[PDB]
Amino acid sequence: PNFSGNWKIIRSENFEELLKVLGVNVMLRKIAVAAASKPAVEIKQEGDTFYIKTSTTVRTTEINFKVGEEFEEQTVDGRPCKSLVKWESENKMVCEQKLLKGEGPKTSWTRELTNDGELILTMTADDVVCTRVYVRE
Ligand SMILES: CC1=C(/C=C/C(C)=C/C=C/C(C)=C/C(=O)O)C(C)(C)CCC1
């Protein structure tokens, strides 16, 4: 797979609901949903090594990881976690997360390149799943 690109969002589902499961209050959800409606996403992939930068007006994250090697990031709601990404399949990576401190819903994410050339991000918190779809700019 080649996940490299500058990716533009074309669909979001259940993001507000995901934030509600994670305990984000309604005013903060409103801020977040609006900002997340127009993100800039940069991915660079070199084999199993990845750089992903996701930028919005209210939050930007930058992660560097190798598939198969633990790394530290934050959950979508901003809590430090340890993460490990695996290939579920040739074109789909899955990341399990464990909080560094405290308790909360079980969180994960997936990124997949679909047969039509798009990118699907999913983010999960307990049983609630957020689906976001992107195409390169
Ligand atoms: C949740 C949350 C916030 C904003 C989070 C944002 C904006 C996340 C965007 C995610 C994207 C942009 C995902 C993607 O597309 O990969 C703010 C800072 C208001 C503080 C309250 C907790």
- SS3 annotation, 27-63: HHHHHHHHHHCCCEEEEEEECCEEEEEEECCCCEEEE
Pocket of ligand 1 (CB under 6 A): 19, 24, 28, 31-32, 35-36, 39, 54, 56, 58-59, 76-78, 121, 132
- Obtained via which technique? X-ray
Reduced to 3 states, what is the DSSP secondary structure of residue 78?
coil
- Protein residue with least CA distance to atom 13, ligand 1: 36
Domain residue spans of the chain: 1-137
Topology of domain 1-137 in CATH is Lipocalin (2.40.128)
| Burial 59-98, CB ≥16 within 10 A → b, else e | eeeebebebeeeeebbbbbebebebebeeeeebbbbbebe
Resolution in Å equals 1.5
Give the number of other CB atoms < 10 A from CB of residue 23: 11
Query: What's the CA gap between 94 and 21, in Å, rounded?
Result: 20
> How many whole angstroms from 52 Cα to the centroid of ligand 1?
15
Give the number of other CB atoms < 10 A from CB of residue 110: 17
Strand order in the sheet with 71-74: 60-66, 49-55, 40-46, 5-13, 128-136, 119-125, 107-113, 92-99, 80-89, 71-74
Reduced to 3 states, what is the DSSP secondary structure of residue 83?
strand
Query: What's the CA gap between 135 and 120, in Å, rounded?
Result: 9
